[PDB]
Amino acid sequence: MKCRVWSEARVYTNINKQRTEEYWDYENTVIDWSTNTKDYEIENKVGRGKYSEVFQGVKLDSKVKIVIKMLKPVKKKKIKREIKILTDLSNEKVPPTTLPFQKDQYYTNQKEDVLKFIRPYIFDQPHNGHANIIHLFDIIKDPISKTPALVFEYVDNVDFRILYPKLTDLEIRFYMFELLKALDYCHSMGIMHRDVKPHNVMIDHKNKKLRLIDWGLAEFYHVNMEYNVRVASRFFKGPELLVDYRMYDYSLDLWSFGTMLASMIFKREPFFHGTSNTDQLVKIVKVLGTSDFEKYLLKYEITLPREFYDMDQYIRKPWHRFINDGNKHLSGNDEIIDLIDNLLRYDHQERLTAKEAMGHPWFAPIREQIE
Ligand SMILES: Nc1ncnc2c1ncn2[C@@H]1O[C@H](COP(=O)(O)OP(=O)(O)OP(=O)(O)O)[C@@H](O)[C@H]1O
Ligand SMILES: [Mg+2]
Ligand SMILES: [Mg+2]
């Protein structure tokens, strides 16, 4: 019970008050494992992560090419959670983001100081963000090896350190818009991803196809719940995770989105490159400045963890300072800088929501092409 000032999501606050136990209570599910991998031919390894080794394969009945994610040992409820989130997201008959926009059902946090963060622009159209969520096809467990495994849609993906340097300005705008649609959708479904980063964004460039994968750290948003802060990876951790503000929400994904975006635009990878947990916060404050950092700690009456007391005073780095001739083709306009500036804010309440980000001027050339 850490938090002094309490916080609620600006938007989609009450999804899991609307939805019941059978939707969000993953701990009280029983996983219906398939006894056999007999339906699948498992081929070669195509990727890995902290929690898995992932193999390409074929679903033999249909000949559809798939991937199989072999899960490393973890608490069993983490497995139930990933499965529940993936099935909630794929099984929704009418994705809320396909329905006509309802402002009063969107801006649900009615605190006067939170309402001031409503932007003058917003993408208010129905969209297909649900189609950017990876699809789970099966759950399997080998009887002999006892390895839990998740069968997904295959995406023909190239490592971001190869692909991203090739992308044009317009292509970055396109893909990042696709990512925002996926986030708007999972947020509308009362779910925070909490591990938004390039390795978790599959892109098939020739098919202009984007999928948001890796739902193993995702969690249901419940109003005033205090969550574990030891999630995501160091480089993408929002300030709330570092200062141990546990009452966070969907806006954590928008900090991650912003840090991913800042890396692509300024070609500094990763953008906040901490050499330790402690130094991760230092790298952030070196950029956003000490002054706003202290205003933020004051706003929520946060007592800084002990490790951060050796931090020096930093003057804010204007974003302009990240522009150079190597990156100016991506960074050399006011729109991208204002976008980044409005995502990468200490105060999570201040950050653009996915829908607000989608209506930002920087995405005009993408929005223009929708109709
Ligand atoms: N559907 C897919 N199509 C193609 N490649 C995939 C797919 N799913 C996963 N991969 C590859 O496997 C890697 C690991 O998968 P995933 O991110 O789901 O596992 P993880 O172990 O939970 O990762 P993290 O360390 O970010 O938590 C991915 O980064 C990706 O390169
Ligand atoms: Mg991953
Ligand atoms: Mg949002």
Q: Is the CB of 200 under 6 A from ligand 1?
A: yes
Contact 21, 190 (CB under 8 A): no
Distance CA 232, CA 229 (A): 9
Tell me which residue of 218, 205, 207, 208 sits closest to 159, measured CA to CA: 205
Residue 214 CB less than 6 A away from ligand 1:
yes
The atom number, within ligand 1, closest to the CA of 51 reads 21
Q: Distance (Å, rounded) from C-alpha 240 to C-alpha 348?
A: 8
This entry's atomic model was obtained through: X-ray
Opening angle at CA 300, ends 118 and 228, nearest 5: 95
Nearest CA to ligand 1 atom 18: 214
52 is in an annotated binding site: yes
> Which single residue is written with the structure tokens 């929690």?
51
Sign of CA dihedral 179, 181, 185, 191: positive
How far apart CA 179 and CA 167 sit, in angstroms, is 15
DSSP string, 117-131: T--S----S---GGG
Domains and CATH numbers, the chain: 1-29+155-371 (1.10.510.10), 30-154 (3.30.200.20)
Q: Report the alpha-carbon distance of residue 37 to residue 40 in Å, rounded.
A: 6
Binding site membership of 82 for ligand 1 (Cβ less than 6 Å): no
* Alpha-carbon span 361 to 259, nearest angstrom: 19
Q: From CA 216, how far away is CA 83, in angstroms rounded?
A: 8
Q: What angle do CA 284, 246, 11 make, to 5 degrees?
A: 90
> Taking the CB of residue 85, how many other CB atoms lie within 10 A of it?
25
Residue ID of nearest Cα to ligand 1 atom 22: 51
Sign of CA dihedral 4, 9, 10, 15: negative
292 phi/psi in degrees, rounded to 5: -70, -30
Residue with the smallest CA separation from ligand 1 atom 10 is: 47
Q: Is the CB of 54 under 6 A from ligand 1?
A: yes
Instruction: Give the three-state DSSP class for 152.
Output: strand
- Give the torsion sign (CA, 319, 320, 321, 326): positive
Phi, psi of 54 (to 5 degrees): -115, 125
Query: Which of 200, 207, 212 gets mutated to test ligand 1 (max ligand atoms within 8 A of its CB)?
Result: 200
Picking from 208, 209, 210, 216, the residue whose alpha carbon sits closest to that of residue 233 is: 216
Q: Which two tokens stand for residue 333?
A: 């306009």
Q: Give the closest residue to 213 by CA, choosing from 182, 187, 185.
A: 182
Strand partners, 91: none
Atom nearest to 152 CA in ligand 1: 1
Active-site residue flag, 341: no
Which residue, chain included where needed, has tokens 């790298």? 283
Shortest-distance ligand to the CA of residue 72: 1
Question: 195, 214, 249, 253: which is the annotated catalytic residue?
Answer: 195
CA distance 154 to 175: 18
User: Does an H or E element contain 342, and which?
Assistant: helix 334-343
**131 CA → ligand 3 middle, Å:** 17
